[PDB]
């Protein structure tokens, strides 16, 4: 896992481009993805 560097991430099918940073948001145990108002990926939980 690499943080604070612009990389290509494939977290089981996200297949998106962006820089990954630590977040204070808390997900539900079953929840994996994250979306904003515009239905764009905003935060993803590390599978490991």
């Amino acid at each position: 896992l690499v943080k604070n560097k612009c990389v290509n991430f494939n977290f089981n099918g996200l297949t998106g481009t962006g820089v990954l940073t630590e977040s204070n948001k808390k997900f539900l145990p079953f929840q994996q993805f994250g979306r904003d108002i515009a239905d764009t990926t905003d935060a993803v939980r590390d599978p490991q």
Partner: protein, 49 residues
């Protein structure tokens, strides 16, 4: 008397602006229109066309 009326009128403006939420309707409408146009433009990427 005029000084007191002026002060009380400004205080009433203070109270009316603080209480009523729809006071800044023009600015809120402009901001909402711009944000909604931006949201529609962004959502247009998800359409097949």
């Amino acid at each position: 008397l005029i000084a007191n009326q002026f002060n009380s009128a400004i205080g009433k403006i203070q109270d009316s602006l603080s209480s009523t939420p729809s006071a800044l309707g023009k600015l809120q409408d402009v901001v909402n229109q711009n944000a909604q146009a931006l949201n529609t433009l962004v959502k247009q990427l998800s359409s097949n066309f």
